Amino acid sequence: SMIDDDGYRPNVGIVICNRQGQVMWARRFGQHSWQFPQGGINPGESAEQAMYRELFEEVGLSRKDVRILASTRNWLRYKLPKRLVKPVCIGQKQKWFLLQLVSGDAEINMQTSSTPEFDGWRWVSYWYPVRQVVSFKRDVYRRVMKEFASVVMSLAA
Secondary structure, eight states, X not given: OOOOTTSEEEEEEEEEEOTTSOEEEEEETTSSOEEOOEEEOOTTXXXXXXXXHHHHHHHOOOXXXXXXXXXXXXXXXXXXXXXXXXXXXXXXXXXXXXXXXXXXXXXXXXXXXXXXXXXXXXXXXXXXXXXXXXXXXXXXXXXXXXXXXXHHXXXXX
């Protein structure tokens, strides 16, 4: 995606849950760091379209495999560590989506890109991601999981 004039890339994040309130947690390609799927928003792309493209590209799923349970209202922003930093990108502004997986686990394919975002995934408990994502994303993850919590835990009831 293209860096806005403040130095932020627009971007969508995806929280995928199951019926017992677990969420899909994926290992960044060739690292030991884990996160939710996140993708860029191409010009002309709506946030929802960008989310579905990211879903296909890195999770291998269709609209048919999921249902959208919620989404965040406005941009959530994080800045990149100065070290890990054309117009210079200093961070991301993100819109987040809560999906329920309704197809079998086997529909998930994280290996279709020539450069995967992820090596693979596993199910984890709902709150686990907050303490586990890399620290500069922790503020954002905490707000995302809190906004999505009332929806997911009602599913796990």
